[PDB]
Design an enzyme around this catalytic site. Structure first.
Site, short mmCIF file in Angstrom:
data_model
loop_
_atom_site.label_atom_id
_atom_site.label_comp_id
_atom_site.label_asym_id
_atom_site.label_seq_id
_atom_site.Cartn_x
_atom_site.Cartn_y
_atom_site.Cartn_z
N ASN A 18 0.86 -1.18 0.00
CA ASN A 18 0.00 0.00 0.00
C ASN A 18 0.90 1.23 0.00
O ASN A 18 1.18 1.84 1.03
CB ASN A 18 -0.95 -0.02 1.20
CG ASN A 18 -1.88 1.18 1.23
OD1 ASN A 18 -2.09 1.84 0.21
ND2 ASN A 18 -2.43 1.46 2.40
N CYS B 70 -6.20 2.74 -3.84
CA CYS B 70 -7.59 2.30 -3.71
C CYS B 70 -7.81 0.90 -4.27
O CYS B 70 -7.25 -0.08 -3.77
CB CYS B 70 -8.53 3.28 -4.42
SG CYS B 70 -8.64 4.91 -3.66
N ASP C 100 -6.15 -8.05 1.89
CA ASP C 100 -6.11 -6.68 2.41
C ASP C 100 -4.71 -6.12 2.16
O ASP C 100 -3.84 -6.12 3.03
CB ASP C 100 -6.47 -6.66 3.89
CG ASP C 100 -6.51 -5.26 4.48
OD1 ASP C 100 -6.15 -4.30 3.77
OD2 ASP C 100 -6.91 -5.12 5.65
#
Lengths: 334, 14
Positions: A9, A14, A272
């Site tokens: 990330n 997004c 995730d």
């Protein structure tokens, strides 16, 4: 501890990490992406080569995978770039470049074979006998969810006939203004079906978006033979749920996670970003209906083409000239 | 944006 590795990330990308995992586990796409002749491309601006590195790293790396060179390749290095585009626009940006690179080579026409479907949209006059047929292609379907209880009810609303009566009569040209009926009918459905649920809406009144957190149901198995015009036996439109892209939050807070059953066996994991973890089938399907956490995109795969779309990808599938070039690049990083 | 539009994500203008 899951067999699959995640994506870093590195700011605000997004839905990109969710989309890369969806395309990477489209195994027929992955093996075909490895086949692209990219030996002479420029690593700074070649997004087909950039997508190969991410796919190779997702298959081999034990550590979270970086996407900085991939974001730079198609010009979305600004942190606002991903907020100013929808998830379908990004997918079209990736698929357009890999399909143009596949032009003239042995893996030409892959992208249309997996993701392309045929659609017709008509206008039929009520009084006079005039009909304007319009055939066009799609690579993804946008479904309306506000008011609609499940995927069944969104597909019937997509094909429902609209009445062009009143001061909305259809301009039939020589026939003049005529009451008519407009609608859309599906001809064929692609083996890999991308479905974006419209969970967000901009009203012009207040200068902000609004999230639909209403409950919307989707099945693990989706028979779409009813909505096909000229259905054929021996190949029903029965689809199996593969990916569910999830957004949780409101008009401001939001996190993008994806759930996937890689092998198509119903064994689900939550992706995730850099944290990949096993999860229950209920958490991936029924917990994402909403009613807040809910899904915004769904990927289905035809049961008939299931085996060849999710065919096992081994290290021998990656060309050695590509391999030597990526492992080149890895040595210069250190 | 200047009209009723829908998206799949939190799409903003430029």
């Amino acid at each position: 501890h899951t067999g699959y590795v995640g994506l870093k990330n590195q700011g605000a990308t997004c839905y990109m990490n969710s989309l890369l995992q969806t395309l990477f586990f489209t195994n027929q796409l992955r093996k075909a992406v490895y086949m692209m002749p990219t030996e002479g491309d420029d690593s700074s601006k070649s997004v087909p080569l950039a997508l190969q590195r991410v796919f190779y790293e997702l298959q081999h790396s034990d550590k979270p995978v970086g996407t900085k060179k991939l974001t730079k390749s198609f010009g979305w290095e600004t942190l606002d770039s991903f907020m100013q585009h929808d998830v379908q626009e990004l997918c079209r940006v990736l698929l357009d470049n890999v399909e143009n690179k596949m032009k003239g080579t042995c893996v030409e026409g892959t992208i249309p074979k997996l993701f392309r479907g045929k659609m017709v949209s008509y206008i039929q006059c009520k009084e006079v006998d005039y009909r304007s047929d319009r055939r066009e292609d799609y690579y993804d379907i946008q479904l309306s969810i506000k008011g609609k209880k499940n995927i069944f009810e969104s597909f019937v609303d997509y094909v429902a006939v609209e009445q062009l009566d009143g001061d909305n009569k259809y301009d039939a040209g020589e026939h003049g203004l005529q009451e008519a009926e407009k609608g859309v009918k599906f001809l064929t459905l692609p083996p890999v079906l991308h479905l974006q649920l419209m969970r967000f809406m901009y009203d012009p009144q207040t200068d902000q978006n609004i999230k639909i957190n209403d409950r919307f149901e989707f099945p693990e198995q989706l028979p779409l033979d009813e909505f096909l015009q000229k259905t054929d036996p021996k190949d029903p439109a029965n689809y199996i749920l593969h990916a569910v892209l999830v957004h949780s939050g409101d008009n401001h807070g939001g996190h993008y996670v994806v759930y996937l059953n890689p092998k198509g066996d119903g064994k689900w994991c939550k992706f995730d970003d850099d944290v990949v973890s096993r999860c229950t089938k209920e958490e991936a399907i029924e917990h994402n209906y909403g009613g807040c956490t809910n899904a915004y995109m769904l990927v289905y795969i035809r049961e008939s083409k299931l085996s060849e779309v999710l065919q096992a990808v081994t290290d021998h599938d990656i060309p050695q000239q590509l391999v030597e070039r990526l492992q080149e690049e890895k040595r210069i990083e250190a | 944006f200047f009209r009723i539009r829908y998206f799949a994500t939190n799409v903003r203008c430029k």
